[PDB]
């Protein structure tokens, strides 16, 4: 409704001020929060655009090796996407009290939403290529996101607003899951360092992703080809 | 078509059982036992792959139908709260809507 | 029924089940200039917008970290002058990375972090200027667009010259740019079988072009007739006149390769012929005329052919009278 | 062990079956006339919480269903060879 | 009477009736560097003036649409500072697209449409900078200007060496830049007729260069004598001494192809010979001399020839004594 | 036990005792683009930082030599405006050499030495812009990254076709970019001995590819089977079936060379085969299928092979029944 500020346009344009304790500003700490999400979003859309995103325009169309930690990353991802959709909602109900349009409450987890979705599309296209250690962009993302959320958690501790705030319990749950993603990525570093047999099997449901094990996306190509032809033995 | 695949792999297995109960003295007489055991093993592998593909097709249908069944709950809940916040549904009939 | 290469030179191959996607990932440059043109302008614009917006967020971080986006201003001089928005920092990153450099927003010597982020913005921006402008010049500079200005005959023929049967076609050049070291590979491809039982589905075996040396090199200025004389070691030795029809497994492809004299980059012109595109017992017309001291070739007459009397037998059968 | 995988998928699916009456209680207890207690008594976020909980309930129920079919199919092949 | 290639290497072909103009339209780049030089500077200047004037009209649209060309000014800050004419916006588009960027006219953050038109001006201007500067560098970087620094003999000869008749000519290099993989194609072209009745008007058949391997490769440092020994399979086997005169249909063209070692781009040097440019029974003089430890070739002596006694008969007739 | 080339194409050579380091010093450019990538970004960044910091010290020398770094200022106008630190001169050298040019620091016409140091900064900065951006474009533009998108067979075979033994392997192309003039050199390398006593340790002798002309050229669109028929002049004439095992001194390397049609720069794909990688008496499966008017090759089926009955003897022994 105003010019879009990122912060408090009101209070005679306060809270842009850094003056005393320089990392003590909440606008500074969500401005530090939004930088790894745009780093994955701006390193990952080039390599996924150039390596899987219609480089092979219709002519790629088979053996699927899974990296370790495979159920754990996707279940911990759905915990992250769940709690960060709660961050989008708890940001926008805190913004909607006063008509000033504070964009620090919802824009950084909107970038984290796009970063978590493109991180899982990065993991889904970095397995089944089996280039195994082009995951060094992804471990950089869990280090920088875990670092800036621990800075946000101890700066929430220094204002002593704790366990009454849904933003506090929200950010503490994000603090423990970002270190959980970092420890399963260093578990991927742990085995060896920087196969499954597949000879005309065609039933992929033991060895696919956890989401596409759960909602069966491999079978969609069979029901697409059933309209082409009656299927055989 | 997957159902037709399931019945066309169901009948050679049961006729193989009905053959091998009938000519058992001849089949044990030729000493061909491991080979017709292997023919049984091939028939059961074709039966298990066709029943598993009919299973995964039915599980595909049920996750897509219940995902759009969950959209019913989302849309009817948001029109019940968006109409009962402003206009008058008298704040009890929304429990029927949600239930 | 299904042709291998098209008549315009495209190849009808599907490439089933390429599992090894990491060898596609290890190379980026030929994959980058491999793309169709609106994907190239999309990766051009979004690579530049990605670098400008990410360095704009870095300048917005610097101007927030000094508190210069606070309008409560005392006397301490900012790290970059006259930034009080994010979009002013986006304008400042557009002034830095394009090196426009207006000067109402400019860097002062207060922040050393602004100097180091200006250094790494100038290095990353010069590097993507080198990669993206050389990539778009190598995109527009290839000579796969040359190859349909080297038009072949729509119908190939087979006729009799010097006693023997010669498989003839004609290829024309449409501009004054000559092609250095124009090489001809004529490949007859069909499903053959070994005598020991090996069936190969598309067996590309070459026939030699009859040149006069034996090495395949032509000088395409005027449109000239490429002819391969069918000999006993050639695989067209048992070709019938009745075999030249549809659904006969017989495909000739003609590969013209050379280097364009204007650009300096090499090219490959390819065409195909189906079995019913071969006219038995016919030959071309003379298309070259002379007037006022100059020669003239007629490209309206280029696919024009004429019936001649030939015997209706194989070249194996023309060793037996 | 595939049966206890199927059963604990039905334990977690039927654990997520008991979100709905709590969501109905919260939504129309809001309609009688940011902290967490106000955050779990807004009916729009409580309705989309009901949507995600019912979504996860349905996919865990069908995962329970599939792995029970796969255990019975490996049972049928093993006892047909034993017969 | 009418020669095929000129003595300077240009070809006298007219190219009648090219109907298919859409295949000229599908390619633009080889058509762009195909042009003669003042058309290239005209398309260079008018492409840049076209982009600057059209984006100048876009900035004039933006400054009219905010009302900043109205001199009745209150306090609301303009989208681009200090534009109050069309020609100030033309100066502003010249500051943007060349990235000069003076700063008396500069963009402020009021108009987002000015930011998006600045983005698409910078993308379109960087793209035409890449295309037009690489196109003018590929225009000036070709080696068709190399080929008249590879001067051939003005008169070719025919003489006797090792018992047989050899068609001789000499080709000189004029600078210290060597030519990697210098290939020779000598083509004798005339109107021949088939025994079966096919008359072909300019039948380019090659004679092989006598090398010593059989593959045509030379090392042109000193000017050396290219010789093709006339054999029975060569088509100059029945050449008379009386046939070397004007209006005899006989044309030899000599194609020197290679790659320049300085530029890296390939070249093609071509010459021709009419039938009265061939001197019967003559040969060249030795032009190579040694002094003070170095060798010296004489380019004043380069077309100098000498009469020798040869028999005045064909090489077919020199198998019959 | 020790292979010559790897299966991925790298060569296992150590290069002992290269004493002549001055011939490495006389060339810099192929040594510069020879390096691995973080050394190239290190020499890129430190070359630019070296030139900016050294010219920044030259501007700091000029501003000290006029006394403009003295804050005791009268009225005499400085040589460069608004420099009062070293880091302001570093910002001024970054404004000059990148041609950003903000204007709060700018050159005035008082000092002629500032004009001459601005001239030599602009010349040296334009020269290192040309060398470093063209060097980083030639670094990213090479086609040694192409060569593992040209995948060979993991196992080579030997089978019987047209009566004779042929050494077979298959090579696949993974994208729609065609390779112009694809040449095959198959070299069998082992330690051989002369009859006169000369022992050579890695004797690279080539076998010819059986083509149909005799010249090695293929048209790799579909993956085709390269076969060399073992003849009596080939050095695989006395090869046993029992010799195909580990620690047998026998190594075949297959060299695919050509030029990429997208980039225009040439390439070389190489693989090797050890003696236990050769399967005796086997052949490939047909991998090419046709559906809906198009052809389809199966890259999951690409290393798939099949046992066939062959005699277990040498090709020397197959001239003796």
From TrEMBL, chains C, E, F:
Coiled-coil boundaries: none
UniProt KW Plastid keyword: no
Site (Role in the control of polyamine-mediated channel gating and in the blocking by intracellular magnesium): 129
Membrane topology field: Multi-pass membrane protein
Transmembrane domains' residue ranges: 41-62, 113-137
Keyword entries, A-Z: ATP-binding, Disulfide bond, Ion channel, Ion transport, Membrane, Metal-binding, Nucleotide-binding, Phosphoprotein, Potassium, Potassium transport, Transmembrane, Transmembrane helix, Transport, Voltage-gated channel
One Gene Ontology cellular component annotation held by this UniProt entry: inward rectifying potassium channel
Domain Inward rectifier potassium channel C-terminal span(s) in chain numbering: 150-321
Subcellular location(s) of the protein: Membrane
Residue ranges occupied by any Potassium channel inwardly rectifying transmembrane domain in the UniProt entry: 5-142
Biological process terms in GO annotation: action potential; apoptotic process; CAMKK-AMPK signaling cascade; cellular response to nutrient levels; determination of adult lifespan; negative regulation of insulin secretion; potassium ion import across plasma membrane; response to hypoxia
Function of the molecule: Inward rectifier potassium channel that forms the pore of ATP-sensitive potassium channels (KATP), regulating potassium permeability as a function of cytoplasmic ATP and ADP concentrations in many different cells. Inward rectifier potassium channels are characterized by a greater tendency to allow potassium to flow into the cell rather than out of it. Their voltage dependence is regulated by the concentration of extracellular potassium; as external potassium is raised, the voltage range of the channel opening shifts to more positive voltages.
Family: Belongs to the inward rectifier-type potassium channel (TC 1.A.2.1) family. KCNJ11 subfamily.
Subunit structure: Homotetramer; the homotetramer binds four ATP molecules (one ATP per subunit). Forms an heterooctamer with ABCC8/SUR1; one KCNJ11 homotetramer interacts with four ABCC8/SUR1 molecules. Interacts with ABCC9/SUR2.
Protein name, entry field: ATP-sensitive inward rectifier potassium channel 11
């Amino acid at each position: 409704m105003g010019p879009l500020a990122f912060c408090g346009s009101e209070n005679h344009s306060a809270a842009y001020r850094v003056d005393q304790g320089v990392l003590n500003n909440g606008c500074f700490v969500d401005a530090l929060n939004v930088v790894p999400h745009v780093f994955l979003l701006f390193i990952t859309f080039p390599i996924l655009f150039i390596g899987w995103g219609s480089q092979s325009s219709k002519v790629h169309i088979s053996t699927w090796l899974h990296f370790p930690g495979h159920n754990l990353r996707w279940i911990l991802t759905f915990m992250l996407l769940f709690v960060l959709v709660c961050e989008i909602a708890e940001g926008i109900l805190s913004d909607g009290v006063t008509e000033s349009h504070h964009l620090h409450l919802y824009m950084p987890a909107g970038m984290a939403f796009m970063a978590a979705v493109t991180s899982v599309v990065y993991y889904h296209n970095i397995e089944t290529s089996n280039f195994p250690k082009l995951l060094i962009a992804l471990l950089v993302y869990w280090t920088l996101a875990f670092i800036t959320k621990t800075i946000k958690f101890v700066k929430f501790l220094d204002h002593a607003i704790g366990f009454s705030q849904l933003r506090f319990c929200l950010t503490g749950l994000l603090v423990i899951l970002y270190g959980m993603l970092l420890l399963v990525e260093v578990n991927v570093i742990r085995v060896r360092r920087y196969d499954l047999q597949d000879l005309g099997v065609r039933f992929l449901q033991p060895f696919v992703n956890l989401l596409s094990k759960g909602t069966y996306w491999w079978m969609n190509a069979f029901i697409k080809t059933a309209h082409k032809k009656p299927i055989d033995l | 078509d997957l159902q037709q695949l399931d019945d066309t792999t169901q009948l050679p297995l049961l006729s193989h059982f009905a053959e091998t109960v009938e000519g058992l003295t001849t089949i044990r007489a030729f000493r061909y036992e491991a080979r017709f055991q292997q023919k049984l093993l091939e028939y059961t592998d074709s039966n298990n792959i066709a029943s598993l593909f009919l299973t995964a097709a039915n599980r595909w249908l049920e996750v897509r139908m219940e995902y759009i069944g969950a959209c019913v709950v989302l849309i009817a809940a948001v029109t019940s709260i968006s109409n009962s916040l402003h206009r008058e549904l008298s704040a009890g009939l929304v429990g029927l809507g949600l239930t | 029924r299904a042709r291998f290469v098209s008549k315009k030179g495209n190849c009808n191959v599907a490439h089933k089940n390429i599992r090894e996607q990491g060898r596609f990932l290890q190379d980026v440059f030929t994959t980058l200039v491999d793309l169709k043109w609106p994907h190239t302008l999309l990766i051009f614009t979004m690579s530049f917008l990605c670098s400008w917006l990410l360095f704009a967020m870095a300048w917005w971080l610097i101007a927030f970290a000094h508190g210069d986006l606070a309008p409560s201003e005392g006397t301490a001089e900012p790290c970059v002058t006259s930034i009080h928005s994010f979009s002013s920092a986006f304008l400042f990153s557009i002034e830095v990375q394009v090196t426009i450099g207006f000067g109402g927003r400019m860097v002062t010597e207060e922040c050393p972090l602004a100097i180091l982020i200006l250094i790494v913005q100038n290095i990353v921006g010069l590097m993507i200027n080198a990669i993206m402008l050389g990539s778009i010049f190598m995109k527009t500079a290839q000579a796969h667009r040359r190859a349909e200005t080297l038009i072949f005959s729509k119908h190939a023929v087979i006729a009799l010259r010097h006693g023997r049967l010669c498989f003839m076609l004609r290829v024309g050049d449409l501009r004054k740019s000559m092609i250095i070291s124009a090489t001809i590979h004529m490949q007859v491809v069909r499903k053959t079988t070994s005598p020991e039982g090996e069936v190969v589905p598309l067996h590309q075996v070459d026939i030699p072009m009859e040149n006069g040396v034996g090495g395949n090199s032509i000088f395409l200025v005027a449109p000239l007739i490429i002819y391969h004389v069918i000999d006993a070691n050639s695989p067209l030795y048992d070709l019938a006149p009745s075999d030249l029809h549809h659904h006969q497994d017989l495909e000739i492809i003609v590969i013209l390769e050379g280097v364009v004299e204007t650009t300096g980059i090499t090219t490959q012109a390819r065409t195909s012929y189906l079995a019913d595109e071969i006219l038995w017992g016919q030959r071309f017309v003379p298309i070259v005329a002379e007037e006022d001291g100059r020669y003239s070739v007629d490209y309206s007459k280029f696919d024009n052919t004429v019936k001649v009397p030939t015997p209706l037998c194989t070249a194996r059968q023309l060793d037996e009278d | 062990r595939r049966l206890v995988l199927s059963s604990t998928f039905r334990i977690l699916a039927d654990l997520l079956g008991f979100a709905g009456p709590l969501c109905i209680f919260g939504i129309v207890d809001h309609l009688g006339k940011v902290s967490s207690q106000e955050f779990l008594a807004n009916a729009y976020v409580l309705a989309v919480l009901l949507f995600l909980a019912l979504l996860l309930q349905r996919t865990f129920l069908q995962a329970s269903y599939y792995v029970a079919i796969e255990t019975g199919i490996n049972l049928r092949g093993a006892i047909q060879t034993k017969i």
